[model samples]
Structures are given as structure tokens and as C-alpha cells.
Target: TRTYDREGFKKRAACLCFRSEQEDEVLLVSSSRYPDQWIVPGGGMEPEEEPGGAAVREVYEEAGVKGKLGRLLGIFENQDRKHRTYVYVLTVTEILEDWRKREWFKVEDAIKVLQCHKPVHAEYLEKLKLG
Candidate 1:
């Protein structure tokens, strides 16, 4: 069983990890379902797991990096998947096994690749540009 919000949408959290406060580079990971394709680091929230907490946990597990958690980039909703994901920013302050291979990509490249099959996720990056 999975946790769901009051709206019945799955509760999820994701992080847009940065190489530094400069925000020049972003971290992404290979998708388990599509190893050749890259996607944001995230997963569904566990019971009683705060959104921010969940985001960092997922980022560590999937992206294999940890850092100072930053702002809430956006609270994105995907109607197609019925998920409500709290997207946050994390600056890489620390650095996994049996997990997705993480890599860094230029901000521009990240958006382009993520946008291909992750329009909602790409939106998180676009929102980050606001601040």
C-alpha cells in the first residue's frame, strides 16, 4: 500500500540538486524503468515523512548525493499519474550503491533531456529560474 494525499493523488517528492550555490549544474539519474533515459531523483513519500524529508531521502537513494536542502522549487501535480510532488532544491554538500547512476548536466541540457519524457519534472527546473 502507498500513501496518498487527501485528494487521492500519490504523495511524492523530488529534488533538483546543484553542484553549488551558483546553480550552474544540476544532478540527474538514470531511470530504473528506462536505464538509457535520465530523469529527476524522486520517489513516493513514506507515511509521516515530511515532504522535504522525503525529497532528501529519495535524492540520496536515487541520486546517491546529499546536500543542504534549499527552497521548494514548486509543488507540481501530474494529472496523468495522479501524483503531487513537492520539488525542492538541494546543494551538493556530500556524496551510493545498487542505485541509479547519478551524473551532472548543464542546466540547459538538464531541461532539454528532462523535458523529453518528463514535462512535469522539467517544470521544476523552469520554476527554479524564478528565484
Candidate 2:
């Protein structure tokens, strides 16, 4: 018998936005209660939104940065429900300058509040620099 259960296996999408290793920071929103726990820039797809389009929309709504779609990193499956998630590489298209932002923390804020640190090593830093 297949032990996999497809419970609440709804489709979702997200974007892994990367900045410089020295500036390796991600946007995070402050929860009303927790006010911590930084999350990646993404959200669920809209009813008529494609996965790729949803990713872009999420970035804009959350981070206010426009991104361009690139290659696909393949789909991931949840072991329990066998749900799938498609990940794609997004390149920064435009950043709204001088825009009033909200609860966005740097790596230090994330480390202190969210208790999570960035893996900003030389290898990935060099990759971003070269790429």
C-alpha cells in the first residue's frame, strides 16, 4: 500500500532572493505577536496566477523588488502529502528607490530576533560577484 497521503497538498511557489555575501540579507515581516522569524520572499499562487507569476508578485508585494524569471531549479515534493513546489531562479529587474519600507531586518536583526544567521561564505559570495 502507498503510505503517502495527499492531505492539503496544495500547490505553492517561492523565490530565494540572494544579495551580496557582505550584504547577504533577506526581507522579513514582523508578525503582530512574534515580531520575528524571518521568512523567504514568497507566497501561494493566486487562482489565475501561474507559479512563476506568483513568485514575481510575491516578491513585489513583500519586498517591493521586481524580479525576472530565469531557469527552473526543478520541483520539490513534500514527503507526507506528495505535494510539489516549483523553484525558479529570479534576477533582480528593478528596485524601487527611496520607497518607504516596513519591518525589514538585516542579517544581524534576523540573527538576534529570528535566531537565524545567513550562510554568507566566500564561495557563494564569489559566485554572486562573478555571476
Candidate 3:
């Protein structure tokens, strides 16, 4: 019989929504867990929940912005085959200045949106610019 304990590492769905206001501006945020590291807003998925839905939910929860999911950007997997993350791009609809508190996020946490040319996925950003 199969054992749950022996199962490999779980797969996660990660979403990244970008908005361009000027020539080379892209949205970015710093992580609370890693203060120095800036990353796209995203997280893991829930049981019976669609990956896309998880991505949209994560954007709102983490970035305090309403995102309309666009397309599945790509899937990234670790060499160890232990972890896989599905990445997607979305469009920003609204930004919440006074956002509500959530269990996963704290008011004191480092969460602020910035528009800069530096993006984690530079290649994808270029593609998005053309398309």
C-alpha cells in the first residue's frame, strides 16, 4: 500500500502580475520572510482549488492588489524533482492602500509595491512587452 509519509515534496503554484506605467517600470515587492529579497507575489495552492485561483488569491493576499489573471507563464521545477511551481502573469485592477489583515500577512510586515526596471523574470517581461 502507498504511504502518505513517503510522498515526495509538494508542488506549488506561484503567480506574478506585472503592470507597466512608463517605459521600463515593473511592479515588485519585498518579502517579509526575507527582507532583502524581492519577489513576485505568490504562494502554494489549496486542495480542490484551481492553480489559477490560487494565484489570483495569493496576489490579493500578499500584495494588497486585485489581479485579473491573464495567462499561464510557465512551470518551474527543481532539479531534485521535489518541488514544482506554476507561474502566471496577471493584470492589476486596483490597489488597496488600507488593506485588511490576514492570518498569512501582518500589518507590520514589509509589503510595498514598487515600479522599477529590475524584475526577477526579465526574459518574461520582455516577452510581455512585445505581446
Q: What's the lDDT for all of these models?
A: 0.87, 0.51, 0.54
Which tens-of-lDDT digit does each residue in 25-121 have in candidate 2? 5444433344443454555566666778877777777666775665555555555645555555465657766542334345454445434422221
Rank by lDDT, descending? 1, 3, 2
Q: Mind giving the per-residue lDDT tens digits that candidate 3 earns over 1-131?
A: 11111346455666555453221333455566665555566666666667787777778887777757777877655546464556777766677787622222121121322113223334344444456
Query: Please, what are the lDDT tens digits per residue for candidate 1 over residues 11-127?
Result: 999999999999889998886677887888999999989999999999888888879999888788999999999999899987744444678988888999888957777888888
Ranking by TM-score: 1, 3, 2
Q: For candidate 2, give the lDDT.
A: 0.51
Q: Which residue ranges in model 3 land beyond 4 Å of their true spot?
A: 1-9, 20-24, 99-131
Query: Which is superior by TM-score, 2 or 3?
Result: 3
Could you tell me the lDDT of residue 59 within candidate 2? 70
Q: Backbone clashes per model, in order?
A: 0, 0, 0
Worst 10 residues of 3 by lDDT: 105-114
At residue 115, candidate 3 shows an lDDT of 19
- Model 2 scores worst on lDDT over the 10 consecutive residues at 117-126
* Candidates in order: C-alpha RMSD to true structure: 1.7, 7.6, 8.2
Better of 1 and 2 by lDDT: 1
